[PDB]
Design goal:
Blueprint: E1 25-30, E2 33-37, E3 48-55, E4 65-70, E5 74-78, E6 85-89, E7 92-94, E8 105-108
Antiparallel strand pairs: 1-2, 2-5, 3-4, 3-6, 3-7, 6-8
Function: Mediates spermatid-Sertoli adhesion during spermatogenesis.
Domain Fibronectin type-III: 20-112
Organism: Homo sapiens (Human)
Length: 118
Amino acid sequence: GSSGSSGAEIFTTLSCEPDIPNPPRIANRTKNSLTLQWKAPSDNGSKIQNFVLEWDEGKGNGEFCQCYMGSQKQFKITKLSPAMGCKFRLSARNDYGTSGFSEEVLYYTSGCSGPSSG
């Protein structure tokens, strides 16, 4: 932790791309499936049209491709394999355009598991 507080004197509105939304978390992952859930950022300027999710199809090369694009904030990617590291990224796009993409997140489908440190 570290001291952190903001507070700028009122100012005129801003008409530009929205702020980068937080990265999607895991709510349920299987050997052949992966469930991800994310929230909505701060709508500033214009209501966000839809969300644009991307992933490297769990290949491990570094090529992100449109996986899901819509309003919903939850998508379960089925037809996967166990022990397959796959990355993802969330981004909001409004009348203006798609805002910066969240921080690349790396996940690994269910699989091997051991005891808890104790």
